[PDB]
Structure formats: C-alpha cells, structure tokens
Amino acid sequence: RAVDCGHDDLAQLRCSYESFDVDSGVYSVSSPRGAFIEQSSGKECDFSPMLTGTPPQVYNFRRLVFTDCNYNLTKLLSLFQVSEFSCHQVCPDALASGCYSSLTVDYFAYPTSLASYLQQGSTGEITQYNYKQDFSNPTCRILATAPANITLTKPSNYNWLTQCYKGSAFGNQPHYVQTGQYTPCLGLAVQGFSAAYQSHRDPITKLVATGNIAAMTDNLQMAFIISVQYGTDTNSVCPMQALRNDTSVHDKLGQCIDYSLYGLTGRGVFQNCTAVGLSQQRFVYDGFDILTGYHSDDGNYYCVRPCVSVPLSVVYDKPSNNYATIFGSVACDYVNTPIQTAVGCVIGLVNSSLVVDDDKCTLPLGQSLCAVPSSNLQLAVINFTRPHLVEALNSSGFVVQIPTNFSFSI
Amino acid sequence: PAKADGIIYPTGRSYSNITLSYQGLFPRQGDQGQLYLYSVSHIGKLFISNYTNETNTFDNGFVVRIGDAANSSYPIIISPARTIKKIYPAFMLGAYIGNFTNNRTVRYLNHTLVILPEGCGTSLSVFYCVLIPRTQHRCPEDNAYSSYVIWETPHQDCVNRNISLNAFKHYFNLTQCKFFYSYNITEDEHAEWFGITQDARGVHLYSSRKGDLYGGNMFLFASLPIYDTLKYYTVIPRSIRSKYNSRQGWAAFYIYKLHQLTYLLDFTVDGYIR
Amino acid sequence: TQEYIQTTIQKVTVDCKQYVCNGFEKCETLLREYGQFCAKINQALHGANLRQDESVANLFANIKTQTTQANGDFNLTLLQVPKVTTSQYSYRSTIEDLLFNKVTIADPGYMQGYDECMQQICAQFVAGYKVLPPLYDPNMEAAYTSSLLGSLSSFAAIPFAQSIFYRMNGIGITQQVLSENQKQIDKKFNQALNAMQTGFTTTNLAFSKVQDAVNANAQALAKLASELSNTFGAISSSISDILKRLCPPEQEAQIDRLINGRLTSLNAFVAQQLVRSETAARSAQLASDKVNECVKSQSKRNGFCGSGTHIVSFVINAPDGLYFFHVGYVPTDHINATAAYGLCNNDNPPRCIAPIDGYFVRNEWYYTGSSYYNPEPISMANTRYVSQDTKFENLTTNIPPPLLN
Amino acid sequence: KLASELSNTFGAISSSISDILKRLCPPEQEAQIDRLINGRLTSLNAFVAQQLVRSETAARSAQLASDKVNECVKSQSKRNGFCGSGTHIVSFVINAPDGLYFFHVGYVPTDHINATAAYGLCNNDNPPRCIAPIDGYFVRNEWYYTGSSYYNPEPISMANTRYVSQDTKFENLTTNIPPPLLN
Amino acid sequence: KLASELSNTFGAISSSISDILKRLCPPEQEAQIDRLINGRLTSLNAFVA
Ligand SMILES: *[C@@H]1O[C@H](CO)[C@@H](O[C@@H]2O[C@H](CO)[C@@H](O[C@@H]3O[C@H](CO)[C@@H](O)[C@H](O)[C@@H]3O)[C@H](O)[C@H]2NC(C)=O)[C@H](O)[C@H]1NC(C)=O
Ligand SMILES: *[C@@H]1O[C@H](CO)[C@@H](O[C@@H]2O[C@H](CO)[C@@H](O[C@@H]3O[C@H](CO)[C@@H](O)[C@H](O)[C@@H]3O)[C@H](O)[C@H]2NC(C)=O)[C@H](O)[C@H]1NC(C)=O
Ligand SMILES: *[C@@H]1O[C@H](CO)[C@@H](O[C@@H]2O[C@H](CO)[C@@H](O)[C@H](O)[C@H]2NC(C)=O)[C@H](O)[C@H]1NC(C)=O
Ligand SMILES: *[C@@H]1O[C@H](CO)[C@@H](O[C@@H]2O[C@H](CO)[C@@H](O)[C@H](O)[C@H]2NC(C)=O)[C@H](O)[C@H]1NC(C)=O
Ligand SMILES: CCCCC/C=C\C/C=C\CCCCCCCC(=O)O
Ligand SMILES: *[C@@H]1O[C@H](CO)[C@@H](O)[C@H](O)[C@H]1NC(C)=O
Ligand SMILES: *[C@@H]1O[C@H](CO)[C@@H](O)[C@H](O)[C@H]1NC(C)=O
Ligand SMILES: *[C@@H]1O[C@H](CO)[C@@H](O)[C@H](O)[C@H]1NC(C)=O
Ligand SMILES: *[C@@H]1O[C@H](CO)[C@@H](O)[C@H](O)[C@H]1NC(C)=O
Ligand SMILES: *[C@@H]1O[C@H](CO)[C@@H](O)[C@H](O)[C@H]1NC(C)=O
Ligand SMILES: *[C@@H]1O[C@H](CO)[C@@H](O)[C@H](O)[C@H]1NC(C)=O
Ligand SMILES: *[C@@H]1O[C@H](CO)[C@@H](O)[C@H](O)[C@H]1NC(C)=O
Ligand SMILES: *[C@@H]1O[C@H](CO)[C@@H](O)[C@H](O)[C@H]1NC(C)=O
Ligand SMILES: *[C@@H]1O[C@H](CO)[C@@H](O)[C@H](O)[C@H]1NC(C)=O
Ligand SMILES: *[C@@H]1O[C@H](CO)[C@@H](O)[C@H](O)[C@H]1NC(C)=O
Ligand SMILES: *[C@@H]1O[C@H](CO)[C@@H](O)[C@H](O)[C@H]1NC(C)=O
Ligand SMILES: *[C@@H]1O[C@H](CO)[C@@H](O)[C@H](O)[C@H]1NC(C)=O
Ligand SMILES: *[C@@H]1O[C@H](CO)[C@@H](O)[C@H](O)[C@H]1NC(C)=O
Ligand SMILES: *[C@@H]1O[C@H](CO)[C@@H](O)[C@H](O)[C@H]1NC(C)=O
Ligand SMILES: *[C@@H]1O[C@H](CO)[C@@H](O)[C@H](O)[C@H]1NC(C)=O
C-alpha cells in the first residue's frame, strides 16, 4: 500500500503524519514566472593600463577600480594562463555569472616561485614589507603567467623589499606595510633593486630600504588581487557573458518574477505604486535591507514585495473519508464551487444554512463556523441556546422557579 | 544633528519614512570646527591670514559648511554694513609634506590633490599633479616669499576659464598630472555642504548640490582614483581684488573632522534626512 | 476595582518548509534530510492550538446561565447594548466598545487579509507563519457576556434595585438606613459606574495587563519574523545571495547553517508557545472561578473581588481575556463609639444577650449596623441569646425588651 | 523528542560517531565530532529547561489537587460550580496515571414550576411584627413554606421562619395569619 | 549558568577573544569570533526565555 503525497491535500496530510490513517480535525498543510531585466546602455571597462605597459613590482602595485562598466572576462582569461587561484567568500564562477557594484584589481609582477609568501597567514618579507591582502570584502588572489605574444613588456628582474627600517639610538625600527596600503619605503624603492641585498638610504627621513633579486623567467609571471562589492552603487559592473536582453514589466505585474535591476538579482512581486524615496538612488530599502521599491526607467515606481504562498488547511472527517480545503484569509476571486467564508475561501463545503449547538461541533473552522458530516461536509454556524426567560409579575411579591423533579449529575 | 548637519547620505540606495541606526563617517555633536575667512584686498595688496602655516591632519576626512550667513549684513573684516555673499573653499591635499628652501609654510612633495573653484564660482576643477615650486621674486623659492594664494578680480573677470589655475600656475609648475576633472556649478546663494573621504577605492567627494539642495544632505559626485593615503590638507588662502566702492562681504566656512560614529537617522517620505 | 484575567493567547501555526527554505528549490533537497523535525513542529503547534480551543469552549460553557430575566434609579446604560450602535457587533456593550477602542491591536485579517496585503500583520505570508482565527467570533462572545449580564437550584426574578437592597443589607447595613438613604445610594452607584469609561487609561493595573497581553503576541511574532534575518555564520541571511555568490561544494555548507539555525529557532518558538499556552489555560480556570464567585454571587471572602465589602460585579470581554468591574462598599467617614460584648439582666438565673451582624453601642444601649452608624432600639430580630460571660455588661436600670420577662 | 534529537547531524557528514571515525581523518574527525558534541549539549540544555518548567507546573497543580480534596471530597462545598455543576452533594477521588481523578456528584433540577413568592409577611398588630423564611420561600397554593430546591408547600412555622424588621416590601396579612405571627 | 556560559568554546580554538586574536590571522579570526558571537547570542536568548 502506498500514498502519493502530491495528488491531494489529504495525502499531503497523511505523508506529513507518516501514517495511512489520520484523525478527524482541521489541520494545516503546506502550501519565477517571468523576467524583469533592466540594464544600462553599455560601457566598457578600461583594462588597457594593465595589458599595455611594463608591470610594476610587489611594493609599487598598481590598482584599478571599476564602476558602471561591462568587461569581457573571457578575453582576459584567454590572455593569461592561471597557475593558482584562492578565493575568499566568493567563487570565480559567481564572478563570471554575476554583477557587483565595484571591482578593485591590484596587479604586479610576481614570480610563482614565491607564491607561498602571498598566502593568507604568511610571515615572509612580502607580507611584512611589500603587500598585505585585505580580507574585509569578497576577494580572490590569482597568480597567472603571461605568454610571450602578449603586449606586456617584461621587466629586468623581480624585486621586493626585504626589510624597511629607520632610526638610531633605539635600535632598528621596523616599518611594516598596512592592510591594503603602500609601504612607507616606497619612495626609496620606486627606482627598484639591481643586486641582491642592495640597500637604499634616504637622509631626510632616515629611512633604509633593502631589496632582493629574482632572475627574470622566460614568460612574465604576474599576480592579481581582485575584490568585489555589493549594494554600493546604483549601477553595477557585469561581465559581458552575464548580460541578457531587456524585458519590460508592463505585463506580469503581481506575480513572483525574477529581476535583474541594474545588476540586482532576486525574485519578488512588482506592483505599480506611488513614488516614494529619492529617485536618483533608484532603490528604496527598508530597515532590514530588503528591496522595497524600484524607481524605474519607464518612469513608474514599483513597490517590490517578496513572493508569498497562500496558506492551506484541511478539514478531514475520518468516518466519512471526506475532506475540504480552506484557503486561509484570501478571497475566492484569487483562488479562481468555492464559498467565501469568514475564515477565507473554502472548496469542498456546501452551504445549507444549518445551525449547530456548541457541544455538537466536532470540526471547528476558525470563527463561529463548523463542518458537519451530515456523506457530505456541510458548512454550519455555531449558536448557543439562550437562557430560559422568566417573566416578572406586577404584584406585591416576586415570581420564583422552584425545582419539581431532579436527577444526579456526576 | 537635530538639523541633520553634515550627514553623508548612503550611496546606491534610499530609505523612506523609517528610522535606522547607521555606522559611518559622521561629525561629532557640538564640534565647533575651524573658522576660515576670505577677505577683500587693500586695488592694493592682498589680505590673507596664516591658514598656510598650520599643519592639519586628514584622518578620515572632513565636512565643510559653505554658505552660512550668505544674506546677512555684517561689518567687513578689513574695515570693522555691507551684504555678504558665499565664497567657495580651495583645498590642497597630499600624502607627503616637506619644506621650502626658506622653511616657511607647507610644501607638498610628490603627487598633490588640488581642488580649486573655477570660473568665478561657476565650476570646480580637481587635479592630481606634482607641483614643482617656482624660483622668482615672491614665488616659494625665495626669501621674499610669505604664502601662496589664488586671486579672482571680479572686475575684469566674468569669463576667463583658467583664472584660478593661472593664479595657481603663478606659484607652481604642474607636471606629471594624472587627471583633471571639471564639474559645473549653478550660481546660487543657498548654504551648501561638501565632504572629502578616502577609502580603499580612492578619494570620494560629496556635495549637497547633487541632491537635497535646499537641505543639507550630501551625495557622492566624484570618485577620484587616488590610492596613496592622504595625511595632510591645507586651505589655500583666497583673496578677492575689488574697488573700495565694490567691496562686498564673503561668508566664512567651517571644517569639521569626520569620525567613525554611530548615528540614528530619520528619513522622510520623500527620502531626505531631516 | 477593575481586574483582567487572560483567557487565550494568539494561535500561531508555522509552515516549517516555507519558513526555513523560503521556496528556494535547492534548500528543499537539503531539508529532506531533516525530514521529521518540521512535522514534529507542526504536530506540536497543532496540539497546542487544539488544547487552547478546548479550553475556550470549556470556559464559555462554564459561564453560561440556565435562566434569565427580562431599572429602579440605577443607570445601567454602559453595561447594556447601545440602542443605536457604533459597533459592527450587535451584542457588544458600550463599555466593551470603549475598552476595545483604547487598546490597539493589529488586525490579522481572516476573510480578505491576503488581498488587503497585496493591495498597496502582513508578514505571515512572507515569513511563513499564520495566525489562526479564534474559536468564537467576538459577536458570540459578546452574546455570552450579555446573556450573563441578565442572570442555587431556584431562580428568583427580583429586580436590580431589590438585588442591590438585599446585597447591601447582607453586609451589615440595616433596613432603615437603606430605606431612608435610597436616593443617595442610587446617586452614588450611578456615579461610580460613570467613572468606568474614564478608568481606561494608563497607570491602571488592569488596563496595563490588557496592554501587556496584547504586546506579548506581537513580541512573539516579531521574534519569529526577526529570526529570519540571522546569518548564523553564513555570508548572508538570504538563500538567493548564497546561491548566486558561491559554488556548489560550498553552497550546501552555507545553506545548511541557515537550515540548522532556523530549525533551532523554530524549536525555541514552539517551546515558548507551549509555556504560554498552558499558562493561558490555568488563567481560564481562574477566570471562571472568579465569574462563579464574584459575578454570579455576592462574595463574603475578603480581597477576592475588589477592595472594600463586595456588593456586585460585572464581566465584559477583553482582548484575549475577560474584564471585571468589582463594585465594592468603602467608607469615607467614621465615628468612635463605645460598644458592649453583651448585656445580661438581674434575674436569679442570669440571661445574657448578643447582637447579630451589629454592635451594642451607647448613645441607654442601642443596636446599630456593622457597616453604618444608626442607633436603633434593641429587639428580638437584632439579638441572639448567648451564655453568660464575665465581660458582659450587667445592666439593671433600663433593660431592653428581649431581656424582659 | 529526547530520543529523536540524536538523529540530527548538526551539519556533520553523519549523525553517527562511528561513520565519522571510519570515513574521515584525524585532522577533520574532531571538526565534525565537536559539531555533534555542541549540538547535543544544546539539545540537552533545552530538554532540562523544559523539564524544569514542567516540574514546577505539576508541583503547583499538586497543590491544587490537595485543595480540591480538602474542599470537595472531605466536605460539602457551598461554592458555586467549584467542584462540578449544580449544587454540590458529595465527591470521591481515585488515582490517575499522573494525578487524581474526581467524581463530583451534583444536584441538578430537571423540571420546574413558576410560583408566586413573598419577601415576607407582617401581621395587623399595632406594633407590626414581620417574619422572613430561611432556606426557602413563602409560596401560595394562603401562604405556605417550601424548600429552596424542591417545591413542597408546607405549613409556616417557627422552624421555617426567622423574625425581621418591618419592611414596606412585605405582604400585610389580615385574613389568615401563620402561627409565628400570632400574638 | 549565565556566568558559566562564557566558558564555552562553541567549537573555536579557545573561549577567549584574546587568544583567538593572538593565535590566528585575519582570514580566520572572524571565522572563530563569529562562532563565539553566535553561541553567546543563542545562550543569551535561552537566559531571557
Ligand atoms: C617623491 O619624490 C621624490 C623626489 O623626486 C622621489 O625620490 C626620487 O626617487 C627616484 C626613484 O625612486 C630617485 O631616482 C634614482 O636615483 C638614483 C641615483 O640617486 C639612480 O641610480 C636611480 O636609477 C633612480 O634614477 C631619486 O634619486 C629620488 N630623489 C630624491 C630626492 O629622493 C620619490 O621616489 C617620490 N616618491 C614616490 C612614492 O614616488
Ligand atoms: C539667501 O536668500 C535667497 C533668496 O532667494 C535664498 O534662496 C531661496 O532659498 C529658499 C530656501 O527655502 C528657496 O525656497 C525653496 O524653493 C523651492 C522651489 O524652487 C521649493 O521646492 C523648496 O521647498 C523651498 O521652498 C528659494 O527658492 C530660494 N530662492 C531662489 C530665488 O532660488 C537663499 O536660500 C538664502 N541663503 C541663506 C543662507 O539664507
Ligand atoms: C569578448 O572577447 C572575445 C575574444 O576577444 C570575442 O570573441 C570574438 O568575437 C568575434 C566576433 O564575434 C569573432 O570574430 C572572434 O572569432 C571571437 N574570438 C574568440 C576567441 O572567440 C567576443 O566577441 C567578446 N565579447 C564581446 C561581448 O564583445
Ligand atoms: C609662517 O611663519 C614664518 C615664521 O617662521 C613666517 O616667516 C616670516 O615671514 C616674514 C614675511 O615675509 C618675514 O619678514 C620673516 O623674516 C619670516 N620669518 C622667518 C623666521 O622666516 C611666515 O610668513 C609665516 N607664514 C604665514 C603667516 O603665512
Ligand atoms: C623554513 C625554515 C623552518 C624553520 C623551522 C623552525 C622554526 C620555525 C617556527 C615557526 C615557523 C613559521 C614559518 C612557517 C613558514 C612561513 C611561510 C612563509 O615564509 O611564507
Ligand atoms: C630598550 O632597552 C635597551 C637596553 O636596555 C635600550 O638600549 C633601548 O634604548 C630601549 N628602547 C626603548 C624604546 O626603551
Ligand atoms: C536581443 O535583442 C537584440 C536587440 O538589440 C536582438 O537583435 C536579439 O535578437 C535579441 N536576442 C535574443 C536572444 O532575444
Ligand atoms: C502607475 O501609477 C501612476 C500613478 O499612481 C500612473 O500615473 C501610471 O499611469 C500608472 N501606470 C500604469 C502602467 O498603470
Ligand atoms: C449560505 O446561504 C444563505 C442563503 O443564500 C446566505 O444567506 C449565507 O450567507 C450563505 N453562507 C455563506 C457562508 O455563504
Ligand atoms: C442565535 O440564536 C439567537 C436566539 O436563539 C438569535 O437571536 C441569533 O440571531 C442567532 N445567531 C445566529 C448567528 O444564528
Ligand atoms: C421525574 O422524571 C422522570 C423522567 O423524566 C420520571 O420517570 C419520574 O417519574 C419523575 N418523577 C417525579 C417525582 O415527577
Ligand atoms: C510614515 O510613518 C508614520 C509612522 O511611522 C505613519 O503614521 C505615516 O502614515 C507614514 N506615511 C506614509 C506616507 O506612509
Ligand atoms: C596664526 O596667528 C594667530 C594669531 O593670533 C596665532 O594665534 C596662531 O597660532 C597662528 N597659527 C599658526 C599655525 O602659527
Ligand atoms: C620644516 O622646517 C621647520 C623649521 O623649524 C621644522 O620645524 C619642520 O619640522 C620642518 N618640516 C618638515 C616637514 O621637514
Ligand atoms: C631649514 O631647517 C633645516 C633643519 O635643520 C636647516 O638645516 C636649514 O638651514 C633651514 N633653512 C633655513 C633657510 O632656515
Ligand atoms: C617652471 O616652468 C617654466 C616654464 O617655462 C620654466 O621656465 C621654469 O624654469 C620652471 N621652474 C622650475 C623650478 O622648474
Ligand atoms: C559646463 O558649462 C560649460 C559652460 O556653460 C559648458 O561649455 C560645458 O559643456 C558644461 N559641461 C557639462 C558637463 O555640463
Ligand atoms: C445614563 O448614563 C448615560 C451616559 O452618557 C447618559 O447618556 C444617560 O442619560 C444616563 N441615563 C439617565 C436616565 O440619565
Ligand atoms: C457582671 O457580673 C458578673 C457576675 O458576677 C461579673 O463577673 C462581671 O464582672 C460583671 N461585669 C460588670 C461590667 O459589672
Ligand atoms: C403592607 O403590605 C402591603 C402589601 O402589598 C405593602 O404594599 C405595604 O407597603 C405594607 N405596609 C404598609 C404600611 O401598608
């Protein structure tokens, strides 16, 4: 013997209770239709500064910040051969198929033989004096090799700061790079280092910078530290592979549809609405950071609501094996014989204007309504019997009711 | 904060008819800030204060209250009457400082972020440049040098496009310049608000002329690509050369340092912070 | 003295799958491993709501009255149903209408709440819970209360003025004082009743209890809605952000944190709803005991009804309970009088006497009521024969007639 | 619930300790066993707190059962509806699986007769003397005493009646005077 | 019980914030600190209830 939970709301109840037989009672049973894609006209991110000139070293890293542009990720991944990547709170497939509000890229010439010194908890010279990765946004660290046919010009060698200190009569005072900032010894080290353990000195600030040399490889090896942000700008940075054609919302209003509103992905219910909030920001939020409205290009304001489920109830009667479905607190227009009741639309009950005394009601349906098995299920109304009325007498004394005959009740 | 003074509006989003707690760069309550006044010249020699000899620290940034008392009549600073207009501050921010050959004022080594109002207050020009001092009579490589200024002669001007710039070029040689941005300003007399802050994504400039012009809420309008940490700023002394019959007043401005504080913001139905 | 006793709590059922996964199809595959916990949560909530419905039916069956009667100088306008009604309910009283207008309750919506929330609490459909309707609509509860307002094995049809006369004669005041001061009694009664509408303010204990009873349900619903914003160590509290920002070997790890966190929070919601549900059932038993003692009869027990000597009390409907109006007898002035333990004659067998519900006060010896000073002649109706005591007053000049021969 | 909280995996690869030991490694065995340890300790804390609420509830309800025995079982209760329905006569108590089970015998009427009653009766003497009944009424069909719970017209007597003060609500008798009102 | 709930490690390397700060690196400190934060906020909810 088996039960297909799907077919009927009573099954669902039997599968939830995990028993072929369930008692009589009023139980509760468990209860992406389009696309609204809105995007800008289009703009290309300028990746030429990294792909054109000579790459800099670890201490003198160059940083590009991109906002409100589209970039060809496939072309960039075709230009470079990735040796090793390690991401934090994000994955590169989500970088391929998503949009972010900003994109910060730090790139420099870096040998793959020193790839362990760029790691998360490393204590080498690179982390102490050259570059410290910042872990406060979703970020990735990519080490890639540039082929010989690329437009980049290989440097003379690989340089990095070995130590950077200052001061006298207190010993050496080590100066250590900050999280995501340049080293204090940058002005001494801009010229670079030519021999191993070559030391440069500045007489004004009494700062000393010492470097180290790695031989230049056959193919230029470069390192990337990218970082992404969410919910910062009105526009967004999106890969060209994630761009889809625009769709309007003049139809499909009032249904749970997926939206891509200038890079904002989610699902919800859109309704035409009176304009609130500031138009320029474009996105109206609530206290909890849920998208409340969207000031659209069409010109209309659309108050966004998360798509919901209509609550369900089952009025099961075990002796007659008859059930009815209550749609909780929703009118019968939406459900579209259903009958509108004080507890919502219900299908499976007939209305016959029958009244049942309190104590005769075995299936109470919310308010003063009942389902009786008189087989078919009928909608009733609970009404208690009014007390016996003893009429007063206009005469000198009063009228009293004294018991004749009795019984014993336990 | 009951008038929402110096409040940077959240970027990329808006709120409507709610109150929520925000942590960000906000000024302290009851902070008087720093008074800076721009006066009128003697047409004689220029009249300035010692706004250049002071060493200010950028920290997290600052907010400038521009245009207060832009309709009141006060005695002139140089003749202690006349109506008072609104003047725009000129800034000079850099990461590294040094000294001139005469050890006077502040020099900014390497790349310097210079913000100058342009076109007699009709536009704002922002550039990162390395400025190399000039060797002349009163220019900063001489013993006769006192301070560097920028001057606008309202007589005789306005419309010269490079008046603030030619005033800056009088003192420095602009070489190695990464960028030059220009933003147009409509001529008004409303009290405004301006902010500068540096993040990991560059230098952000905020203003109340973008949105909430009649109030005080500041909105982002420029994200400058400066990634070296700014450590010092100086207010360039600005002087106006006009006749004795033409002397007119100029509103002072206040600079309040920003701090990492928690604020409770009240939003209206229109979305503003009041 | 107004007293509120809480009868119900808000019946809330939770759709566990909708609450945990929010309709994201990748979450249901992970939740199928945690299959039985959602069913156990639903079964526990269903049992709690069923027990609360049984308690409501038992209370409203206990407070019904077998016979009723169809008002002197007493003004019972407030207690009775308004002749022209400002209330959508035809059985509600005026004072019940005032009490329900001064307490603010969010309208859950039982007939068309979904359409009202879709046009232009409404968080039930979003979060995944649902407020079940109460067992009786407020019209039927007001009908029960109004039938009780009309009101042993025998029923006497004496009017309200006669009932007040007998109830205030039973506490110590003699018949002569009630006959002489009838107009003042009616004026004092009507005036006290007229302060009931002005008593529905703050810094009142019963109204504060009503407000806290209203606020407890809202606090429970707010906790249930706000536990969905907890990240539980994940990168976001939204399933969509996890699914669109991460990759499948790491998505199931982070979606799970949300699954395990939300089920534990739901379990703690079920546990605190069980404590509140059994707490509200013992109150209903108390509320009926109070109806059967203070309302259906005159209570001789001190302090159970309101302050002072109890005379009569009325009960109306309140948000999630019943609201009482205990009319008591309090004195404002008093006189110090010399009383006697008893009086004995000078016969050869000494016969001694003692008062009933009164004192033998002086200014020779007179009888007065225990709750009002009115010196009356000592009679056989006022006094009971008692054995002699040495602290009794041996009176020989003027002897009351019950001690004569 | 206590037995079924052991089936929760708590984010681990399995809810069984042996499966974790036989499928994982001494670096990551303790990372998953500690998830079972922390999850089960929190589950035990929720069970203990639930039992403390249930124990203090049954301890107060056992005091209610002792008061119900002392009022309904050991004596006849004069309260209205405290024990059962109708007028209380006698009660019995037996043992239940987790408490005490009571059987409250009550006097309930079935039929009734409307009768004309009197507040009291007074004679025609120059000092008026008045009487009032106890545990009953003065009914007709001239005036007879009857019980307060059963209709049975009986002759008025001293036993049936108590004296009272003169009231204007009382009936004044001239024709037939009961023996307690005789001079 | 309220004082003894602060001695629970909740799966971290230590129950002290100071030990987590001086023994781990910023990729992994917020992973263990959030474990202590979520554990103590849940134990505070049980104390209030
Ligand atoms: C800020 O500006 C100062 C001044 O221009 C910069 O210092 C200069 O840095 C360059 C390159 O780092 C130095 O040039 C080098 O000179 C040596 C010979 O001394 C030569 O062998 C090298 O090939 C290279 O050309 C220059 O001497 C040095 N000048 C001074 C006065 O320090 C500084 O680097 C700038 N800071 C930043 C962060 O760019
Ligand atoms: C100095 O005086 C001038 C006089 O014009 C002030 O300009 C005026 O400022 C008020 C500020 O409330 C402006 O009123 C606004 O009008 C807009 C419609 O344009 C309305 O939507 C706003 O709600 C508000 O009522 C007024 O328009 C403006 N005058 C002009 C000609 O633009 C200036 O604000 C004064 N400055 C100071 C510092 O007191
Ligand atoms: C992203 O870059 C790739 C390669 O640089 C582009 O692919 C080329 O598209 C043109 C036109 O369709 C073809 O003729 C080439 O053969 C393609 N090359 C490769 C290697 O696929 C692609 O079109 C770019 N995407 C966008 C949106 O411009
Ligand atoms: C800053 O302070 C210095 C003093 O150290 C001022 O330098 C003086 O300038 C005047 C005017 O040219 C000369 O007569 C003095 O000889 C200078 N003194 C020294 C010690 O150099 C400088 O003018 C001040 N800058 C201001 C006020 O902007
Ligand atoms: C390799 C020499 C090992 C010497 C071992 C003796 C003592 C070392 C004590 C602690 C080791 C910390 C350094 C671990 C490697 C850092 C990797 C890097 O630098 O990026
Ligand atoms: C530290 O102590 C050493 C030796 O006692 C001394 O040479 C040095 O100057 C001291 N440094 C500081 C900063 O106190
Ligand atoms: C997308 O829209 C463009 C119009 O710019 C159209 O040419 C193209 O065919 C569309 N593609 C799809 C898949 O709808
Ligand atoms: C949306 O509503 C606005 C005002 O409420 C109205 O001006 C506009 O025409 C409406 N648009 C549609 C498509 O109904
Ligand atoms: C049932 O039918 C009667 C008669 O038409 C009607 O008055 C009543 O409202 C109906 N009840 C419901 C719940 O529709
Ligand atoms: C219930 O019955 C009473 C009389 O017995 C009547 O006045 C009232 O209208 C009835 N109510 C319903 C809902 O049937
Ligand atoms: C009481 O009623 C029962 C049935 O209702 C009947 O059998 C019995 O005779 C009656 N007794 C009297 C005294 O009327
Ligand atoms: C704004 O909020 C207040 C209270 O928070 C409310 O009374 C008012 O109706 C709201 N206004 C609008 C337009 O929603
Ligand atoms: C500027 O001059 C004033 C003169 O009162 C003086 O108080 C102030 O310290 C000076 N500022 C600097 C930086 O020297
Ligand atoms: C510039 O010279 C003055 C002269 O005393 C000195 O106080 C100041 O510290 C110097 N500043 C720099 C940046 O060297
Ligand atoms: C500036 O200060 C430095 C600091 O020692 C000094 O060597 C130099 O001589 C000073 N120059 C002048 C012009 O005062
Ligand atoms: C500044 O630029 C002018 C332009 O011709 C040049 O003559 C002068 O020598 C420059 N000054 C310095 C200090 O380089
Ligand atoms: C700024 O104003 C000038 C002068 O009216 C005009 O030539 C220029 O195009 C404007 N720029 C922008 C961006 O509006
Ligand atoms: C009884 O009190 C109500 C309260 O407003 C009043 O309207 C009514 O007139 C009063 N009754 C009499 C008879 O005065
Ligand atoms: C009354 O007489 C009794 C009998 O001797 C005596 O004990 C008592 O003290 C007397 N009381 C007074 C007040 O005289
Ligand atoms: C006598 O009895 C009648 C009976 O109705 C009553 O009305 C009246 O008040 C009594 N007293 C007098 C003094 O008539």
Numbering used by the authors:
A (entry chain C): 343 to 373, 378 to 682, 703 to 740, 747 to 782
B (entry chain A): 50 to 91, 104 to 141, 145 to 222, 227 to 342
C (entry chain A): 783 to 852, 858 to 907, 916 to 946, 956 to 1167, 1177 to 1218
D (entry chain C): 1027 to 1167, 1177 to 1218
E (entry chain B): 1027 to 1075
Q: From the publication, what sentences describe this entry?
A:
Merbecoviruses from bats, pangolins, and hedgehogs pose significant zoonotic threats, with a limited understanding of receptor binding by their spike (S) proteins. Spike (S) protein is the major viral surface glycoprotein of MERS-CoV and forms homotrimers.
Overall, based on structural and sequence analyses, the sialic acid–binding pockets in GD-BatCoV, HKU25-BatCoV, and Japan-BatCoV show considerable conservation compared to MERS-CoV. In contrast, only V554HKU25 (corresponding to V555MERS) is maintained as hydrophobic in HKU25-BatCoV-RBD. Therefore, the lack of these hydrophobic interactions suggests that HKU25-BatCoV is unlikely to bind hDPP4 in the same mode as MERS-CoV, GD-BatCoV, SE-PangolinCoV, and HKU4-BatCoV. Of note, a recent preprint reports that HKU25-CoV binds ACE2 as the receptor.
